[PDB]
Scaffold this active site. Structure first.
Site, PDB file in Angstrom:
ATOM      1  N   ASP B  93      26.769  76.210   0.143  1.00 59.89           N
ATOM      2  CA  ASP B  93      28.069  75.586  -0.081  1.00 59.89           C
ATOM      3  C   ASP B  93      29.115  76.651   0.182  1.00 59.89           C
ATOM      4  OD1 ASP B  93      29.241  73.301  -2.700  1.00 59.89           O
ATOM      5  OD2 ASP B  93      29.827  73.591  -0.613  1.00 59.89           O
ATOM      6  N   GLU B  94      30.368  76.254   0.367  1.00 59.78           N
ATOM      7  CA  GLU B  94      31.359  77.254   0.727  1.00 59.78           C
ATOM      8  C   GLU B  94      31.805  78.066  -0.483  1.00 59.78           C
ATOM      9  OE1 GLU B  94      34.144  73.663   0.113  1.00 59.78           O
ATOM     10  OE2 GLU B  94      32.068  74.064   0.714  1.00 59.78           O
ATOM     11  N   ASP B  97      32.863  77.570  -7.773  1.00 56.45           N
ATOM     12  CA  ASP B  97      34.067  77.596  -8.593  1.00 56.45           C
ATOM     13  C   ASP B  97      33.657  77.541 -10.062  1.00 56.45           C
ATOM     14  OD1 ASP B  97      36.715  77.613  -9.367  1.00 56.45           O
ATOM     15  OD2 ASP B  97      37.103  75.520  -8.869  1.00 56.45           O
ATOM     16  N   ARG B  99      30.752  76.056 -10.788  1.00 62.29           N
ATOM     17  CA  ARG B  99      29.290  76.048 -10.639  1.00 62.29           C
ATOM     18  C   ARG B  99      28.657  74.684 -10.907  1.00 62.29           C
ATOM     19  NH1 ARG B  99      26.906  81.498 -12.554  1.00 62.29           N
ATOM     20  NH2 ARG B  99      27.870  82.049 -10.540  1.00 62.29           N
ATOM     21  N   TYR B 174      40.047  77.118   3.297  1.00 60.48           N
ATOM     22  CA  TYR B 174      39.126  77.327   4.411  1.00 60.48           C
ATOM     23  C   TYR B 174      39.719  76.810   5.720  1.00 60.48           C
ATOM     24  CZ  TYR B 174      36.055  78.688   0.675  1.00 60.48           C
ATOM     25  OH  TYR B 174      35.526  79.345  -0.407  1.00 60.48           O
ATOM     26  N   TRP B 176      38.704  75.100   8.281  1.00 61.18           N
ATOM     27  CA  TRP B 176      38.470  73.717   8.691  1.00 61.18           C
ATOM     28  C   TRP B 176      39.314  72.713   7.909  1.00 61.18           C
ATOM     29  CZ3 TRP B 176      34.635  77.124   7.207  1.00 61.18           C
ATOM     30  CH2 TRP B 176      34.212  77.040   5.874  1.00 61.18           C
ATOM     31  N   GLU B 177      39.919  73.167   6.814  1.00 60.56           N
ATOM     32  CA  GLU B 177      40.752  72.308   5.974  1.00 60.56           C
ATOM     33  C   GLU B 177      42.212  72.309   6.422  1.00 60.56           C
ATOM     34  OE1 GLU B 177      40.027  74.358   2.264  1.00 60.56           O
ATOM     35  OE2 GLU B 177      38.446  72.956   1.695  1.00 60.56           O
TER      36      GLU B 177
HETATM   37  N1  LIG Z   1      38.954  74.680  -0.505  1.00 61.25           N
HETATM   38  C1  LIG Z   1      38.544  74.976  -1.757  1.00 61.25           C
HETATM   39  N2  LIG Z   1      37.792  74.090  -2.450  1.00 61.25           N
HETATM   40  C2  LIG Z   1      37.408  74.398  -3.711  1.00 61.25           C
HETATM   41  C3  LIG Z   1      37.764  75.617  -4.266  1.00 61.25           C
HETATM   42  N3  LIG Z   1      37.243  75.659  -5.509  1.00 61.25           N
HETATM   43  C4  LIG Z   1      36.572  74.498  -5.709  1.00 61.25           C
HETATM   44  N4  LIG Z   1      36.675  73.737  -4.608  1.00 61.25           N
HETATM   45  C5  LIG Z   1      36.108  72.382  -4.414  1.00 61.25           C
HETATM   46  O1  LIG Z   1      35.632  71.907  -5.672  1.00 61.25           O
HETATM   47  C6  LIG Z   1      34.245  71.594  -5.556  1.00 61.25           C
HETATM   48  C7  LIG Z   1      33.489  71.708  -6.879  1.00 61.25           C
HETATM   49  O2  LIG Z   1      33.278  73.087  -7.179  1.00 61.25           O
HETATM   50  P1  LIG Z   1      32.472  73.509  -8.507  1.00 61.25           P
HETATM   51  O3  LIG Z   1      33.558  73.646  -9.545  1.00 61.25           O
HETATM   52  O4  LIG Z   1      31.496  72.381  -8.780  1.00 61.25           O
HETATM   53  O5  LIG Z   1      31.796  74.807  -8.127  1.00 61.25           O
HETATM   54  C8  LIG Z   1      33.739  72.529  -4.481  1.00 61.25           C
HETATM   55  O6  LIG Z   1      32.544  72.041  -3.868  1.00 61.25           O
HETATM   56  C9  LIG Z   1      34.897  72.487  -3.517  1.00 61.25           C
HETATM   57  O7  LIG Z   1      34.811  71.266  -2.770  1.00 61.25           O
HETATM   58  C10 LIG Z   1      38.524  76.505  -3.517  1.00 61.25           C
HETATM   59  O8  LIG Z   1      38.885  77.618  -3.977  1.00 61.25           O
HETATM   60  N5  LIG Z   1      38.894  76.154  -2.288  1.00 61.25           N
END
Ligand SMILES: Nc1nc2c(ncn2[C@@H]2O[C@H](COP(=O)(O)O)[C@@H](O)[C@H]2O)c(=O)[nH]1
Ligand SMILES: Nc1nc2c(ncn2[C@@H]2O[C@H](COP(=O)(O)O)[C@@H](O)[C@H]2O)c(=O)[nH]1
Ligand SMILES: [Mg+2]
Lengths: 202, 200
Positions: B93-94, B97, B99, B174, B176-177
């Protein structure tokens, strides 16, 4: 004469193509291979409308072998599991390049079988109920000007709102940025060749 | 303090990470969402060995609701002839955040692995070596309180959990966004988020 293509070039190719593709009104995207997926994802950024659910992208892999061309669905779509119904949909097939057209031909052919088989499972009759037919379109970054080894339907190729090539190009090898193991050299060459950005900052 | 990330930055993050990920010897990659697939595909370029079939990449979409997990787009293992038993599987995954996404992705894929082991008559307690080894690769792991956990044997093994960069709690934009890649790249260059490896 190898053409080095930068990431930013691909990004802008998708940007300009998105304005055309909006006329096709895609409901979903099917990307062929890893090379198809990257442009597909970038395209989606430009197709996005605030408040409207983002368009889904499905990755497929098609393997073609010599016949006695035989087709194998290496990685396909589980339509039932994904709850993907192709009936009455506008479906955009995305790939990075149209070289001999063989891949696009067989991908379209296979996806048409899927759609037909679904429209029948539903007790739908695409002849009596034409509006339940699946509308396929194609987007590639580069369509090479060269004798093709396979055909695409006339209603696809000759409709400017069904077959979309960001650029129609000479018969040369195109080196995509995601393929490079030295992106610095790759980008330097792209800039030298005029294969970087062509649209300024807004 | 939004951080603009150039395409070439992403490319080189994958390049350096690939050297580490080679130690994990992935047999296949599972990419979460569109943001996962791009780094996955770039990584594959650096994992490729001539004469050796390219590593397969499978895209999944997980929906999480106020947690309820929905397999929005999954893998048809039978159709793909994908057997997770005895495989090293890299989840990509990119960003990590909070998790939450990685936690449930791993959870769901582990269920698949266990299901497949049992169907093959394999007791993974008796034959631990046949178990599926999961690893994770993200471009950015944010330093912040997480809302979900990952296994200790994942997080604390430098050869299982790979973050290209561990970063402050900021929003990462990112390439691509972006709808203006020229502005985006100019910002990235200014911020020191472009290239960091010279030409060969
Ligand atoms: N572009 C971008 N997306 C984020 C960022 N932090 C969280 N996200 C989006 O929030 C989703 C959930 O992240 P999680 O909190 O589950 O790790 C990520 O898969 C991503 O799509 C960030 O810093 N930049
Ligand atoms: N990188 C790159 N790949 C190409 C090029 N031309 C053909 N290919 C590869 O050859 C495949 C088959 O293309 P087709 O001839 O079926 O249209 C494409 O899917 C692509 O993987 C090219 O100019 N550059
Ligand atoms: Mg492709």
């Amino acid at each position: 004469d190898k053409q080095y293509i930068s990431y930013n070039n691909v990004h802008q190719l998708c940007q300009v193509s998105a304005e055309r593709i909006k006329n096709f009104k895609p409901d979903l995207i099917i990307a062929i291979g890893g090379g198809g997926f990257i442009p597909a994802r970038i395209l989606r950024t430009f197709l996005k409308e605030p408040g409207v659910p983002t368009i889904r992208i499905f990755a497929i892999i098609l393997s073609l072998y010599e016949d006695l061309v035989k087709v194998s669905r290496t990685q396909w779509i589980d339509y039932e599991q994904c709850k993907l119904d192709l009936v009455g949909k506008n479906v955009l097939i995305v790939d990075e390049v149209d070289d001999t057209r063989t891949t696009l031909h067989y991908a379209l052919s296979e996806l048409e079988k899927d759609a037909a088989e679904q429209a029948k499972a539903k007790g739908i009759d695409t002849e009596k109920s034409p509006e339940m037919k699946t509308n396929f379109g194609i987007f590639v970054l580069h369509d090479k000007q060269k004798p093709k080894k396979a055909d695409l339907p006339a209603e696809m190729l000759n409709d400017k709102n069904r077959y979309f090539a960001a650029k129609t190009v000479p018969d040369k090898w195109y080196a995509y940025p995601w393929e490079s193991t030295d992106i610095v050299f790759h980008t330097r060459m792209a800039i030298e060749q005029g294969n970087d950005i062509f649209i300024p900052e807004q």
